[PDB]
Amino acid sequence: GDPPATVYRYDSRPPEDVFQNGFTAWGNNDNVLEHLTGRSCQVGSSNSAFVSTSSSRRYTEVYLEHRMQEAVEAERAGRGTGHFIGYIYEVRADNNFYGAASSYFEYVDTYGYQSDYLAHRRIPPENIRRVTRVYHNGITGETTTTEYSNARYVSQQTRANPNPYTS
Ligand SMILES: NC(=O)c1ccc[n+]([C@@H]2O[C@H](COP(=O)([O-])OP(=O)(O)OC[C@H]3O[C@@H](n4cnc5c(N)ncnc54)[C@H](O)[C@@H]3O)[C@@H](O)[C@H]2O)c1
């Protein structure tokens, strides 16, 4: 029952960025509830201090597939071309990654998800092992999946933090 050593992240940005630069959080807002509900992420205030990840690869695949299907529906409605490129990054978790569920309960119990892990501030490029790229051709309907390894990845023994996030 150890914390996961491996987590996954769906993102629109490509490895030429992520493999060299890692992921950087939107900002300095470390309110766990605002992050988990998305209020501080891109669709909200775009200032969350956490980069979202999941220990469940399937979770990130469902997310990617949903964004792809939304591109398909936009084409069927004439408000899009149907083209879609998404990425799933495979990431080594360390002590800056905090379990969402435990962090949520710590927050609500004090001031008031099971597979989600909040990476505080950054996921350095050395933590990012590989990426799966999924390309959906909106014109022909064909989907193609490719994989790439990060030469900058550092293999070391780390796992997610066992404790909830606290500010
Ligand atoms: N992304 C995942 O795989 C993942 C994993 C677990 C949980 N979640 C949950 O989903 C919600 C967050 O979804 P999310 O991670 O897609 O939100 P997010 O705001 O971090 O990212 C959404 C999109 O914003 C862009 N982006 C993100 N950070 C950026 C930055 N610093 N600079 C420039 N562009 C940036 C990218 O296009 C990205 O795909 C949360 O409620 C979270 O709990 C997501």
**Domain residue ranges of the chain, discontinuous segments joined by +:** 6-149
Q: Which of 13, 18, 42, 67 to mutate to test the pocket of ligand 1 (most atoms within 8 A of CB)?
A: 42
- Let me know: does 71 contact 138? Beta carbons within 8 Å: yes
b (16+ CB within 10 A) / e for 98-115: bbbebbbebbeeeeeeeb
- Resolution (angstroms) equals 1.3
Pocket around ligand 1 at a 6 A CB cut-off: 9-13, 24, 26, 36, 38, 41-42, 52-54, 60, 63, 116
| 8: nearest Cα among 104, 119, 101 | 119
Q: How was this structure determined?
A: X-ray
E strand spans, 101-142: 116-120, 122-123, 128-136
Tokens of 77: 């409605």
| 120: nearest Cα among 141, 149, 94 | 94
Give the ligand 1 atom nearest the CA of 25. Answer: 31
| 68: nearest Cα among 113, 133, 162, 20 | 133
Run of H or E residues at 67: helix 57-76
State the architecture of 6-149 in CATH terms: Alpha-Beta Complex (3.90)
Residue nearest to atom 17 of ligand 1 (CA): 41
Distance of alpha carbon 50 from alpha carbon 71, whole angstroms = 27
| 86: nearest Cα among 113, 60, 118, 124 | 60
Distance 76 CA to ligand 1 centre (A): 26
Distance of alpha carbon 63 from alpha carbon 6, whole angstroms = 18
